[PDB]
Design a binder for these strands. Structure first.
Ligand SMILES: [Mg+2]
Ligand SMILES: [Mg+2]
Ligand SMILES: [Mg+2]
Ligand SMILES: [Mg+2]
Ligand SMILES: [Mg+2]
Ligand SMILES: [Mg+2]
Ligand SMILES: [Mg+2]
Ligand SMILES: [Mg+2]
Ligand SMILES: [Mg+2]
Ligand SMILES: [Mg+2]
Ligand SMILES: [Mg+2]
Ligand SMILES: [Mg+2]
Ligand SMILES: [Mg+2]
Ligand SMILES: [Mg+2]
Ligand SMILES: [Mg+2]
Ligand SMILES: [Mg+2]
Ligand SMILES: [Mg+2]
Ligand SMILES: [Mg+2]
Ligand SMILES: [Mg+2]
Ligand SMILES: [Mg+2]
Ligand SMILES: [Mg+2]
Ligand SMILES: [Mg+2]
Ligand SMILES: [Zn+2]
Lengths: 151, 82, 224, 211, 99, 127, 100, 114
RNA sequence: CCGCACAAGCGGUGGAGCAUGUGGUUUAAUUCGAUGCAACGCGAAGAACCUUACCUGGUCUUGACAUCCACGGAAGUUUUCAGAGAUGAGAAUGUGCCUUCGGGAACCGUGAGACAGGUGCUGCAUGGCUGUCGUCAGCUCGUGUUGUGAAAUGUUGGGUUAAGUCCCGCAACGAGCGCAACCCUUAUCCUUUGUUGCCAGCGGUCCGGCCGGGAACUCAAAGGAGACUGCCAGUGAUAAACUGGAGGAAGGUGGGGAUGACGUCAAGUCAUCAUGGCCCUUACGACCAGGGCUACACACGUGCUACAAUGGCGCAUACAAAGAGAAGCGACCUCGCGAGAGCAAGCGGACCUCAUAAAGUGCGUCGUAGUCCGGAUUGGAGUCUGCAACUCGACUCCAUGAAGUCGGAAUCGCUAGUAAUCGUGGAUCAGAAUGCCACGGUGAAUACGUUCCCGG
């Protein structure tokens, strides 16, 4: 991409919910192109998110997303000539994408005897601002704010 | 492993030699290049040298050795470690 | 052309007194408003005597090359050449247009081959993109050597507008001995023009006057 | 920087094959084996008849081979008696009733085989290679070609080192598939060794596929 | 009651020329020809090394595309099969006449 | 009158019967639903008909072998759109801006020499 | 390669050829059930006595033109090498470089 | 439970619980079960002696536990003392079925050496 | 100014087990070449014998292979003994054909030398072929002009492009080899075409396009159309171009191939072949048997399968493409737990067969464990192929169930149908694929950028 600015291709929305942000979410959960088993997990997670974690699942999904999506970032470059921990701000699409990444692997680190169980449990605990990826979100606002002395 | 329908494999010159040996009483340990043939109840109490690539090696064939082939007793490689 | 005929067109006009060439002093009437004024008393007889030579050359079957690369006056010079069945250069002069005649002949041959090929056929045999590319090359060659495709050989006379702008052409001509007829503004060096016309070379009206008078006398020389 | 066989790629496009019979796999290998052997036999025999092209086509009940050369009468000898004996020796070496026929060449200096072999022959004559290939390209382009390239490689003039050289003239468009590029190779066995010679002749463009 | 003529060849050029010839020949005997039926041509691919020694990665891929056609006549009359035996074709073509 | 679906896709195979006056879908003589085990397929196929809101105005009968599930679904979708245009001639713009007459040619890649997979290079070791 | 090898192969072919019938029938006897269980035995004995180089498996495809075992192409019966030049010159009918 | 074996089956599906018996794989397991004609999902629990006896008797039909180890031990033993080649490789503790001693024979070879 | 060069990402490698290559060491020999990028699943598209060149031993000397001269014999077949076989030793049987009667053909043997023979040496003597820089955009010439000349110009500058691509500026103008494009394939529509392919509308059906019947559709493969920055708007010297839009199956060289300038590295190959020159010739040549290439303290590279509930297992149940086949593919039926066997259909193949795709889907199961994960290793017993499976094959079955619980530093690959995963086929081949070469299924993430990294 030295000549053209390329990012993500134009995603098509998840039909049964009509939206595409969930389509991007399942493209995050995908493993080896196995869409089917992935989207099964997202559904089996949002369901019990709705029940044991307050209703409006498609909506609580993003309210937790906000509770986990960070705002400050760090792209440490040789802008001053060497490695310096520089705080920066990144556009929102990269932000929500990385938020998805943070929550997904956090899910992969709970076990809970079931994958959708892990996903739902951690996503709810995020909607409560008491969870796993939110720990490192506060920690990313600790790290992006810890060496702001020289950019 | 050899199929049961075909049965045990032995080369005919070994057959000649062993039957001559048995009818002729104890004889000189016969020499052979055939690691292929299997051991038979005939070759018992006999001894026989099989041509390992370097040199023929004698083996006093006994009963429990029957079935196995000759070559399983003539190690065709030498080694002692490093 | 009569002095009154020139003066109304503005032939007396010239470049700024800041920008003049030393040899042009004899041809300069004076200065007004920091502007060089050309003297028509010299301009008219020299132009007439040049028209005499041009009529002579054209009356011995001469080939005439009208030369001018001004973006304003290109079409004027082209039409001027067409009005007397002659050859022209109206686009940027290419070095070796006369001295490198052999290369121009090879380029002429390619232009002739392309136009003949389109009439003959085989464009359908070519891929549509390839046929379009051949048409684009034919158009580009027609834009470039439109005037000299039919010159056949080196011309017998040259008519040049703004001789300073076209200095490569006159250097070539002198190297070949081909005579130079040129409208020479005060900023030009008149050494290269054997029949020198000192006059404005930018103004469309005076340029068209020069071209029309020359072409009338050239047709006259042809008619006999 | 190795090129690709300029003959091979233009097969079907502008270059027809040198063997046009058809067969299945069962009789395939031996088929080309036979016609190879007849090619080799022939090329040993008619070495003096300036032979350029030799095509084997086999109808179901017979085989027929065709010869493009510049020395017709040589091949024909008298009454084709040498031709007839060739017909015999090929019919038996192919084990099939053969019928050979010749189709001479008009511009012997304009096909790659004849010029390459003339070059390599003069090289065996120990004439100077340089002037040789120059005469080659001169005659070619003079005759009406549009491009000629010659290349000679290995131990030039007996030099104790391999001084490979080449010469080009006219126009030889090697990347333009539709281009008629005749191309061939030959070899000289000097006292000092073996020297390769490659030849390209470009007779211009053809438009409309193989037809 | 039928005569099926199945042809194989190496180039669609010759195969189609032959089909044209044979069907017009059927029109000479007033036959009942089936206009030539192209069938799947087969592609024999071949990948082969080029460097004599060391370079396995360098390779080349050639291919044989055998073209195929089917023609048929639905009324076997002698007046057809005679000409069907009067056929001359290029060596590139293989014929299969079958009643 | 007669309006057909007949979809191939990346060498898929499927045939379909669209007809006005009622709405239903039956696949392979099996009911649509039990066949496309992944719902997203039934979605992607119903999407064009639902977009025009003619779902209950004309019914379809498909039968599909050749290609994979998603490919077949895409093929029959494109065929539905072909047919809708075939039918009213009015839905051109609506459908194209929906992106259905795209007829994508995204295919697999001819596996290339010296590559583990087409566009995949063996793990050369610098060290 | 060494013409000893080429001749060795041609002799191997000649051997495995003439003995084909005997090989086949003894194969039948050994394979088929219902043998006298010594008819099978004496049959496998008489078999192994036949010329060892009469088994066709002993043969090894060899480039007919250059006598090399590796690179054999059953369809043309040539090495991977000789087939190439044989193609580029245009001998193998209908052959050409693929591109797809 | 004891089940006429030194080892005790774990509380799992009967097929898994009986595979715990040495010399008894899955095929052997379900062979025992269907031979006793007992279902597959029962634990060692919820299965009284009235069935444990049946199991013990049906498994005693096959050599298992200590008797099997002795048998394979004697096979290998007489292999070694036969002086047979594979017996040799068993004595020297290297692969006996024609593997690579060049590399990655560590399964039998064991750990690594410089 | 460029590049999956970095960044942005996804997936690895580096740990384990195993497969494979290499070096080391051992050995009787462990054949030979390949050695940074650009050698190390490389020559080899396939070492049980064979192959095979290497060792041990058994042998042969115009010779295994070729031409010549002779001299004799039909050619052969079948058969005995010795031998491990090479080989010898035979005995019978046949003892023929064109012949104008001599012979010739025919082979076969003996002799005779001329001679064969060499994977013996030199890729720093060579041809050929190939890698590499690099599909990089360059490399040059004619002519012209300039200069006394060596030369320069063109080819630089301003833009712009994937591009020395284009445009203007420009004493250069033109060209050539490149680039591009003509070629293949792919994406849309038109031609006949209906067979063995198709089945819309018709009639029947046993419900099977199966069968009348259809020629529409899918196809099949021939021929064609089609995209051109063409259209609109913007931007820009109005230049080139670029941005956007329209339309359109397709938009900006649509996708992918093939296509490798001048040259660079005495790059690689004398063991494909060819070949200068040297070297062997009762032997460095020739034949046979057995052995080795498969060797264990090791090390390195390449891979495979894993470590698990996105999972395993059962049950059902789906869901492709591209191929191959007649000393072949081999149906159905029976038999066998199976690897298989018997029988034998059909098919040189749009017909028959390989050959029922796997992931998927539905249900149940397992509850996080070295486990129902993993499958190494061994034990036992088989199967097929092949003279022959000891060294040293593939496969089944039973039993056994290692290490392994995501792997240091480091490092690799990838910009879309890609990655990642899933199977399928093929070449080679009696048999012997985790390699190679193809085929489809499913199918992502991310790319602010050029600061740097490396390379150009
Ligand atoms: Mg190449
Ligand atoms: Mg040789
Ligand atoms: Mg073999
Ligand atoms: Mg088991
Ligand atoms: Mg990165
Ligand atoms: Mg490893
Ligand atoms: Mg080596
Ligand atoms: Mg060597
Ligand atoms: Mg590789
Ligand atoms: Mg041997
Ligand atoms: Mg070299
Ligand atoms: Mg520039
Ligand atoms: Mg310029
Ligand atoms: Mg190109
Ligand atoms: Mg285009
Ligand atoms: Mg557009
Ligand atoms: Mg070197
Ligand atoms: Mg070397
Ligand atoms: Mg090896
Ligand atoms: Mg086929
Ligand atoms: Mg297991
Ligand atoms: Mg794939
Ligand atoms: Zn002026």
């Amino acid at each position: 991409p030295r000549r053209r600015v390329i990012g993500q291709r134009k995603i098509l929305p998840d039909p049964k919910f009509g939206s595409e942000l969930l389509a991007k979410f399942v493209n995050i959960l995908m493993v080896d192109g196995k869409k089917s088993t992935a989207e099964s997990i997202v559904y089996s997670a949002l369901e019990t998110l709705a029940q044991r974690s307050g209703k409006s699942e498609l909506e609580a999904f993003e309210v937790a997303l906000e509770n986990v999506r960070p705002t400050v970032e760090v792209k440490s470059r040789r802008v001053g000539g060497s490695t310096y921990q520089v705080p920066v701000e990144v556009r929102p699409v990269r932000r929500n994408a990385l938020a998805m990444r943070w929550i997904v692997e956090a899910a992969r680190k709970r076990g809970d005897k079931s994958m959708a169980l892990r996903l739902a449990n951690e996503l709810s605990d995020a909607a409560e601002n008491k969870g796993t990826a939110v720990k490192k979100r506060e920690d990313v606002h600790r790290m992006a704010e810890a060496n702001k002395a020289f950019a | 492993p050899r199929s049961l329908k075909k049965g045990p494999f032995i080369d005919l010159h070994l057959l000649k030699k062993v039957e001559k040996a048995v009818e002729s009483g104890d004889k000189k340990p016969l020499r052979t290049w055939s690691r292929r043939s299997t051991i038979f109840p005939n070759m018992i109490g006999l001894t026989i040298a099989v041509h390992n690539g370097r040199q023929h090696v004698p083996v006093f064939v006994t009963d429990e050795m029957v079935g196995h082939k000759l070559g399983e007793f003539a190690p065709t490689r030498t080694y002692r470690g490093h | 052309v009569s002095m009154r005929d020139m003066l109304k067109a503005g032939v007396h006009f010239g470049h700024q007194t800041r920008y003049w060439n030393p040899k042009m002093k004899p041809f300069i009437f004076g200065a007004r408003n920091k502007v060089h004024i050309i003297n028509l008393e010299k301009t008219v007889p020299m132009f007439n005597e040049a028209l005499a030579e041009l009529n002579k050359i054209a009356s011995r079957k001469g080939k005439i090359l009208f030369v001018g690369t001004k973006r304003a006056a290109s079409e004027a010079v082209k039409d001027a050449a067409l009005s007397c069945d002659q050859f022209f250069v109206n686009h940027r002069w290419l070095g070796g247009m006369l001295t490198n005649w052999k290369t121009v002949r090879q380029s002429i041959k390619r232009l002739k081959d392309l136009e003949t090929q389109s009439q003959d056929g085989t464009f359908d045999k070519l891929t549509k993109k390839e046929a379009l590319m051949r048409t684009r090359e034919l158009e580009k060659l027609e834009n470039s050597l439109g005037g000299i495709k039919d010159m056949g050989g080196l011309p017998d006379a040259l008519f040049v507008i703004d001789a300073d702008h076209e200095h490569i052409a006159i250097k070539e001509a002198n190297n070949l001995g081909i005579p130079v007829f040129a409208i020479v503004d005060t900023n030009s060096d008149p050494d290269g023009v054997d029949f020198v016309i000192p006059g404005n070379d930018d103004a469309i009206r005076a340029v068209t006057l020069y071209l029309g008078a020359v072409a009338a006398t050239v047709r006259e020389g042809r008619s006999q | 920087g190795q090129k690709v066989h300029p003959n091979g790629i233009r097969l079907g496009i502008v270059k027809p094959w040198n063997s046009t019979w058809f067969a299945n796999t069962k009789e395939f290998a031996d088929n080309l084996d036979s016609d190879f052997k007849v090619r080799q036999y022939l090329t040993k025999e008619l070495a003096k008849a300036s032979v350029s092209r030799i095509v084997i086509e086999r109808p179901a009940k017979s085989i027929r081979v065709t010869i493009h050369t510049a020395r017709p009468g040589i091949v024909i000898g008298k009454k084709g008696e040498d031709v007839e004996k060739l017909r015999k020796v090929v019919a038996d070496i192919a084990g099939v009733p053969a019928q050979i026929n010749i189709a001479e060449v008009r511009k012997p200096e304009l096909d790659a085989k004849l010029v390459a072999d003339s070059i390599t022959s003069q090289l065996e004559r120990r004439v100077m290679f340089r002037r040789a290939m120059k005469r080659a390209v001169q005659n070619a382009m003079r005759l009406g070609a549009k491009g000629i390239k010659v290349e000679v490689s290995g131990r030039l003039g007996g030099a104790e080192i391999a001084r490979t050289e080449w010469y080009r003239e006219g126009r030889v468009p090697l990347h333009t598939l539709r281009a008629d590029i005749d191309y061939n190779t030959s070899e000289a066995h000097t006292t000092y060794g073996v020297i390769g010679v490659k030849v390209w002749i470009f007779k211009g463009e053809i438009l409309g596929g193989m037809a | 009651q039928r005569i099926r003529i199945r042809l194989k060849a190496f180039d669609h050029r010759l195969i189609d020329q032959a089909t044209a010839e044979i069907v017009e020949t059927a029109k000479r005997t007033g036959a009942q020809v089936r206009g030539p039926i192209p069938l799947p041509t087969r592609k024999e691919r071949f990948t082969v090394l080029i460097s004599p020694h060391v370079n396995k990665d360098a390779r080349d891929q050639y291919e044989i595309r055998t073209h195929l056609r089917l023609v048929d006549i639905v009324e076997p009359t002698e007046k057809t099969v005679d000409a069907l035996m009067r056929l001359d074709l290029a060596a590139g073509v293989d014929v299969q006449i079958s009643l | 009158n007669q309006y057909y679906g007949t979809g191939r896709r990346k060498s898929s195979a499927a045939r379909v019967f669209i007809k006005p006056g009622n709405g239903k879908i039956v696949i392979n003589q099996r009911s649509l639903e039990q066949y496309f085990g992944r719902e997203t397929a039934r979605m992607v196929v119903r999407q064009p008909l639902e977009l025009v809101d003619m779902v209950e105005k004309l019914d379809l009968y498909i039968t599909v072998k050749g290609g994979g599930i998603s490919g077949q679904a895409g093929a029959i979708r494109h065929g539905i759109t072909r047919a809708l245009m075939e039918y009213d001639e009015s839905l051109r713009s609506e459908l194209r801006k929906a992106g259905f007459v795209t007829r994508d040619a995204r295919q697999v890649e001819r596996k290339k020499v010296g590559l583990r997979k087409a566009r995949r290079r063996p793990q050369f070791s610098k060290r | 390669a060494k013409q000893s090898m080429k001749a060795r192969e041609v002799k191997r072919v000649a051997l495995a050829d003439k003995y084909f019938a005997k090989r086949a029938e003894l194969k039948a006897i050994i394979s088929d059930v219902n043998a006298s269980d010594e008819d099978r035995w004496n049959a496998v004995l008489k078999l192994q006595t036949l010329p060892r180089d009469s088994s066709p498996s002993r043969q090894r495809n060899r480039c007919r033109q250059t006598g090399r075992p590796h690179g054999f192409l059953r369809k043309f019966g040539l090495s991977r090498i000789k087939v190439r030049e044989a193609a580029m010159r245009g001998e193998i009918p209908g052959l050409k470089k693929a591109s797809w | 439970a004891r089940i006429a074996g030194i080892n005790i089956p774990d509380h799992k599906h009967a097929v898994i619980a009986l595979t715990s018996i040495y010399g008894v794989g899955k095929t052997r397991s379900k062979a025992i079960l269907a031979a006793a004609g007992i279902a597959e999902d029962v634990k060692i629990s919820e299965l009284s002696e009235g069935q444990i006896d049946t199991l013990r008797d049906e498994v005693a039909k096959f050599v298992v536990e200590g008797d099997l180890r002795r048998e394979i031990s004697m096979s290998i033993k007489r292999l070694m003392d036969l002086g047979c080649y594979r017996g040799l490789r068993h004595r020297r503790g290297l692969p006996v079925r024609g593997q690579r001693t060049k590399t990655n024979a560590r399964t039998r070879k064991g750990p690594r050496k410089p």
